């Protein structure tokens, strides 16, 4: 250890584990050991002294860095096998002092306990007041929020992007945020939330969002898709070329408006594409043997994607061909359906958007931007949400970004309450509100304050399906995805079981026969083999028995027809015996 704290064996992970009772020493020098930086405690006294903190404070002027701290032997890397041989203190302020002695031989000391939390879990403020499942749910949702994901997003051409218009720093921030660079690239807005049950449209995890707010920029976002198209020449004379396929003088126009395409074959930037629009135009050449030789193979935009063209790029890929990438920009305003979620593990969907005149208001015209329901708090015990609203109130009034470092004994709820009462509000954070519909005061006093909400990337315009009678498959003649977004919904075994339970034979018949795959087959009464040769000259005939009089009609799924045919193809003869 005396060597590893200066230099002979790499101050980095060369663990030394002396297992006393077992009588072994185990020195590991290999890749894959998760180490951890921990201070050193010699004789119940830290090796870190004010000289080190002062030298580190003047970091930019000195050449004193973390490496000079590790060379000085005050911080060493303890891996896990060495951790089962050391006695730690969480905070030096205690656990190194005198009382009825818990431990008199400490060996190390945590730098700060909030370093057991990862990146996506260091965002959540007051993560010690929340329930742990909610903290994991936040570590999940915090990876699905919208924001400036990187600064150079105007020169990235990514398949899917999302840029929140006006993001904000948090007001109640964890002190480990300046290292994840969240003040630089945030992912939310500091909405004024009020835990009220205003009119009913926020029950069961739902939110009432101010329409005036969303109409002044609150939570707008752009959705930058990016399509791709290569210009291949695979077989000789099977050349594909970017070119506006005009009309006859080329075949396969597919009946779409090609007005947008420039002569090159690519739409120009700033042209409001739509559903029945073609973005790229290719014309592959026929084999020149057996219209002109140019077929039409033009990329079509799906109706689920609309917007305006932002960039058009042309270049040679590594395969050498010409290769383009268009970028279609779409502005999304938050509306009924979109998912918003706090930093504390509470997700909801906007159920209605009232206007400023209709929302509640305090004595000073402050209207809530979001009204989450109270029923979300008790069964989830996210009491870090409440404290976050309170600290955000005190912060917005005072003027300093509040501190919500997880394990800090100088941020008590009582202190936040006194700070808030020092500024003219109710100390617990409640305020008397009014009802914008009528004007009367709401009897109970609604909890209101600025909390940090996020816009998740689950917008409802990306989730609507609807199939009336659409594209059918070639083999099974079951429904299939097409141009429009919907190809169908499965009527699985569980739904079949439920409809069996109801007793609805007719609806189950419709769902499994007449809404998926209806078919009529002519079958021979004598031999159940359906190989009748029906004709519009009215000659029903069964080769196999020499019988043209005993043919009957049978309705059955084309799936059942294909099954009986794939069976007949194995010499298994299924005989639909109508008698």
């Amino acid at each position: 250890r005396k060597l590893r704290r200066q230099m002979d064996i790499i101050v980095s992970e060369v663990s030394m584990i002396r297992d006393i009772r077992e009588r072994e020493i185990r020195i590991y020098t290999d890749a894959g050991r998760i180490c951890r930086p921990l201070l050193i405690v010699e004789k119940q006294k830290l090796l870190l002294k004010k000289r080190h903190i002062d030298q580190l404070k003047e970091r930019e002027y000195n050449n004193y860095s973390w490496q000079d701290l590790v060379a000085s032997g005050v911080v060493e890397y303890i891996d896990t096998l060495e951790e089962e041989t050391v006695m730690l203190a969480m905070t030096p302020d205690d656990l190194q002092e005198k009382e009825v002695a818990y431990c008199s031989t400490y060996t190390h000391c945590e730098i700060h306990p909030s370093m057991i939390l990862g990146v996506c879990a260091s965002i959540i403020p007051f993560p010690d007041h929340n329930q742990s499942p909610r903290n994991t749910y936040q570590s999940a949702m915090g990876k699905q929020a919208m924001g400036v994901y990187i600064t150079n997003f105007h020169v990235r051409m990514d398949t899917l992007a999302h840029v929140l218009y006006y993001p904000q720093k948090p007001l109640v921030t964890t002190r480990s945020m300046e290292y994840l660079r969240f003040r630089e690239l945030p992912a939310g807005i500091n909405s004024i939330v009020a835990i009220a049950s205003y009119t009913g449209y926020n029950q069961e995890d739902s939110v009432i969002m101010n329409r005036s707010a969303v109409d002044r920029g609150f939570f707008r976002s752009v959705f930058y898709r990016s399509y791709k198209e290569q210009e291949s020449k695979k077989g000789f004379d099977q050349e594909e070329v970017f070119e506006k396929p005009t009309r006859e003088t080329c075949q396969g126009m597919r009946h779409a408006i090609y007005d947008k395409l420039d002569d090159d074959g690519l739409i120009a930037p700033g042209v409001r594409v739509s559903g029945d629009d073609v973005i790229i135009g290719k014309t592959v050449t026929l084999p020149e043997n057996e219209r002109y030789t140019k077929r039409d193979c033009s990329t079509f935009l799906r109706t689920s994607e609309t917007g305006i063209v932002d960039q058009v790029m042309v270049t040679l890929n590594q395969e050498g061909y010409k290769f383009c990438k268009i970028r279609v920009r779409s502005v999304r305003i938050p509306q009924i359906g979109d998912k918003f979620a706090s930093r504390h593990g509470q997700k909801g969907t906007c159920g209605i958007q009232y206007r400023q005149e209709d929302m509640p208001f305090t004595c000073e015209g402050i209207t809530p931007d979001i009204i989450i329901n109270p029923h979300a708090i008790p069964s989830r015990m996210t009491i870090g949400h409440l404290i976050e609203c309170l600290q955000g109130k005190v912060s917005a009034n005072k003027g300093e970004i509040g501190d919500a470092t997880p394990f800090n004994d100088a941020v008590n709820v009582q202190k936040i309450s006194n700070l808030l009462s020092d500024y003219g509000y109710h100390l617990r954070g409640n305020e008397v509100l009014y009802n914008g519909f009528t004007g009367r005061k709401i009897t109970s006093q609604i909890f209101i304050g600025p909390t940090y909400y996020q816009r998740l990337k689950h917008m409802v315009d990306d989730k609507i399906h609807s199939r009336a009678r659409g594209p059918i498959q070639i083999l099974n003649r079951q429904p299939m995805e097409g141009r429009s977004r919907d190809g169908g919904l499965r009527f699985g075994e569980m739904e079949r079981d439920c409809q069996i339970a109801h007793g609805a034979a007719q609806f189950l018949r419709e769902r499994l026969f007449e809404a998926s795959d209806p078919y009529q087959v002519h079958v021979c009464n004598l031999c159940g083999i359906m190989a009748i040769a029906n004709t519009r000259t009215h000659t029903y005939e069964c080769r196999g028995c020499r019988n043209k009089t005993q043919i009957s009609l049978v309705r059955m799924p084309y799936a059942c027809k294909l099954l009986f045919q794939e069976l007949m193809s194995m010499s298994i003869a299924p005989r639909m015996m109508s008698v």
Partner: protein, 40 residues
């Protein structure tokens, strides 16, 4: 169409498909003998 308006299948009897029945039922008279799809 007009062939004994639709009757519902009441039984499905399984069996092996004889050679004579398959030959009589087949629509290719001689049987497929040219491995190519189309010539001209």
């Amino acid at each position: 169409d007009s062939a004994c308006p639709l009757r519902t299948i009441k039984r499905v009897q399984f069996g092996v498909l004889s050679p004579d029945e398959l030959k009589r039922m087949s629509v290719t008279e001689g049987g497929i003998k040219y491995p190519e799809t189309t010539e001209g």
